[model samples]
Target: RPAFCLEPPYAGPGKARIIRYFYNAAAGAAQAFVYGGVRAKRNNFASAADALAACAAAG
Candidate 1:
């Protein structure tokens, strides 16, 4: 499989590097991929801001 980073890294728990998302054009689906955190995808982009907000509020 192949992938790429979506944006600059952000501060989080420990070594929170944001590796954004993946796409299989053959599958027609997408998902978020983040290290040291959770995931959420919207419009082929990782909704990191929203996900992080949800994380902070939940934790």
Candidate 2:
């Protein structure tokens, strides 16, 4: 388990509740991040590795 399950969500003026993934060396796997404007909802993943796998399977 990670110190925090959720990597925390981010928001801006133009982005919506968009969930994206990136490789986090500290996590040793890909991680999910939510960025959007206020009121945007966030999606949680079990782990960054899993999230990357999901993306690969999706595409």
Candidate 3:
């Protein structure tokens, strides 16, 4: 897995955590990022290959 994203957790009897992949242009340009049930500076990415790499790791 890449450092940009993570696999989403399973939805068990209770609510499990999840990872969300999306695009944002808050920086004046659209960029892909991997968000999670948690947050940190590492979650924000500026490259598609990197973010997609993160998503690919989920599968």
Candidate 4:
């Protein structure tokens, strides 16, 4: 299956990296491919930024 990176271009290197990692991890752990979707909700940043923050903080 394929996994999609919801990463935004404006995100910092570290944030983009971690978001990609989590996206990969989630896709890998899932039963099928995951694709990109939606815009950033809160956090005063992109969803990708939030995702990366969540990923790094998760670790």
Best-performing candidate as measured by TM-score: 2
Question: Of models 3 and 4, which has the larger lDDT?
Answer: 3
Off by over 4 Å in 3: 1-40
Each prediction's whole-model lDDT (CA):
0.41, 0.49, 0.39, 0.32
Q: Model 4, range 1-59, lDDT digits (tens) per residue? A: 11233332323323222232233343422122222333322222335444445433442
lDDT of 3 by residue, 1-59 (tens): 44333333222242434443332323322253334434334434446555445444445
Runs of candidate 2 exceeding 4 Å displacement: 1-15, 37-59
Q: Give the clashing pairs for model 3.
A: none
Steric overlap count per candidate:
0, 1, 0, 0
- Candidate 4, run of 10 with poorest lDDT: 28-37
- Per-model TM-score, in order, reads 0.25, 0.36, 0.26, 0.22
User: Which 10-residue span in candidate 2 carries the lowest summed lDDT?
Assistant: 1-10
TM-score of 3: 0.26
Highest lDDT model number: 2
Q: Candidate 1: deviation at residue 5, Å? A: 14
Choose 1 or 3, whichever is better by lDDT: 1
Candidate 1 stretches with Cα past 4 Å from truth are: 1-14, 24-27, 36-59
